[PDB]
Amino acid sequence: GRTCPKPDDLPFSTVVPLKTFYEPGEEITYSCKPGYVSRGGMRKFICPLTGLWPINTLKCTPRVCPFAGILENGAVRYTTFEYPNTISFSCNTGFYLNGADSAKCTEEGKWSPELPVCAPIICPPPSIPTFATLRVYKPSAGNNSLYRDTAVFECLPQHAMFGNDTITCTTHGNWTKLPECREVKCPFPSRPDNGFVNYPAKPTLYYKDKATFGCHDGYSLDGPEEIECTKLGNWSAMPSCKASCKVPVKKATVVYQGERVKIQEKFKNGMLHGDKVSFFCKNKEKKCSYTEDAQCIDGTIEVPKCFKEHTDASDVKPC
Numbered sequence: 001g002r003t004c005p006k007p008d009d010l011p012f013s014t015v016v017p018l019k020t021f022y023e024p025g026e027e028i029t030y031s032c033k034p035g036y037v038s039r040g041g042m043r044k045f046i047c048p049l050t051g052l053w054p055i056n057t058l059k060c061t062p063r064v065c066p067f068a069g070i071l072e073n074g075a076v077r078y079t080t081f082e083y084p085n086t087i088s089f090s091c092n093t094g095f096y097l098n099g100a101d102s103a104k105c106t107e108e109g110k111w112s113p114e115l116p117v118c119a120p121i122i123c124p125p126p127s128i129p130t131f132a133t134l135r136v137y138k139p140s141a142g143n144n145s146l147y148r149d150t151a152v153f154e155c156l157p158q159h160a161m162f163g164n165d166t167i168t169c170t171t172h173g174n175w176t177k178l179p180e181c182r183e184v185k186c187p188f189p190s191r192p193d194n195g196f197v198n199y200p201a202k203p204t205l206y207y208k209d210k211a212t213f214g215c216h217d218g219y220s221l222d223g224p225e226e227i228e229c230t231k232l233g234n235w236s237a238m239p240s241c242k243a244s245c246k247v248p249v250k251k252a253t254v255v256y257q258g259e260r261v262k263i264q265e266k267f268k269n270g271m272l273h274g275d276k277v278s279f280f281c282k283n284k285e286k287k288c289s290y291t292e293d294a295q296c297i298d299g300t301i302e303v304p305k306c307f308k309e310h311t312d313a314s315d316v317k318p319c
């Protein structure tokens, strides 16, 4: 031989000076690329007179960054800790990442940026809204609260609360929206005709105060017996006293609440406003029976025109 040929390309290295052929006596140098390393340092060779480059034992491998697989209270995502890999971080519920959430292993074999740590999310003590009191509240980390902890507010007597009464410690370290407590008033409730109404002996009625209604015999409420002063300044309802109905026939089987009853029994004392029943009517043609409805409305009940009073449409087969 008279010249050495182009030197072989080894895995993660560079050769210098890189030429396609060399005169015996010229020198080349193999180095690992930045970020890799090899047992034995760099290797130098002189082209020999035979024109054959000698055996190259250079073996370049990536620098390894210090072990970073364990993040207290969190998780690390990774494949290997070698140049030039990246590792990412995240924290368990309740903690926040104090630092960068990703890091790369550098040419120098250091992590960049520096590795983070997880830390507990906390909220300082909540502030108490204007006309309220703090019912349910207890610190769980020094004088502060932990993530998802809660505090519960209760308004002062005569005040209505607007917005949830419960707050939670969030991840941004503050609590969720606070509620407000305004005082609310209701006008006195009106006495219903044929009835009476009762309510506390105060000169003024506030939120949550209650009134109860009653009727004189022969009448009944067409609403709830008890009513409340609501947060919007009006009452939950204003029932009135409606007239009862005398039973409209002397004897008859009717359907009352999907069930047969003898009208003059079930309604011994009259039918209340609202009460609905179904009379039985006979279809002379098909010799069977159907029912028409009727309802007591403030003292009147219209008995279906087809109804006949006492062989009993009640005892005839259905259509």
Ligand SMILES: *[C@@H]1O[C@H](CO)[C@@H](O[C@@H]2O[C@H](CO)[C@@H](O[C@@H]3O[C@H](CO)[C@@H](O)[C@H](O)[C@@H]3O)[C@H](O)[C@H]2NC(C)=O)[C@H](O)[C@H]1NC(C)=O
Pocket (backbone or CB within 6 Å): 172, 174, 175, 176, 177, 178
């Ligand atoms: C608790 O603290 C967090 C974090 O600072 C607060 O969240 C921040 O809320 C503001 C407004 O709600 C966000 O800014 C911008 O406001 C405009 C309003 O003109 C809105 O149109 C935009 O969409 C945007 O939200 C800000 O980005 C947001 N910050 C974060 C990190 O989410 C939160 O308000 C605080 N909670 C309470 C109850 O004070």
Ligand SMILES: *[C@@H]1O[C@H](CO)[C@@H](O[C@H]2O[C@H](CO)[C@@H](O)[C@H](O)[C@H]2NC(C)=O)[C@H](O)[C@H]1NC(C)=O
Pocket (backbone or CB within 6 Å): 232, 234, 235, 236, 237
């Ligand atoms: C109490 O007063 C409020 C005040 O208006 C009544 O009306 C509110 O509720 C209605 C429900 O059907 C809504 O249609 C109205 O938009 C709403 N009014 C306002 C100003 O928000 C409310 O119904 C009253 N409640 C009762 C039981 O009578």
Ligand SMILES: *[C@@H]1O[C@H](CO)[C@@H](O)[C@H](O)[C@H]1NC(C)=O
Pocket (backbone or CB within 6 Å): 142, 143
């Ligand atoms: C709790 O708060 C008080 C101040 O009222 C303070 O003196 C004390 O050191 C705090 N405790 C902790 C654990 O931070």
Ligand SMILES: *[C@@H]1O[C@H](CO)[C@@H](O)[C@H](O)[C@H]1NC(C)=O
Pocket (backbone or CB within 6 Å): 164, 165, 166, 167, 168
């Ligand atoms: C507040 O009330 C809402 C009603 O929609 C309820 O779903 C929620 O659980 C309450 N707030 C909190 C923090 O629980």
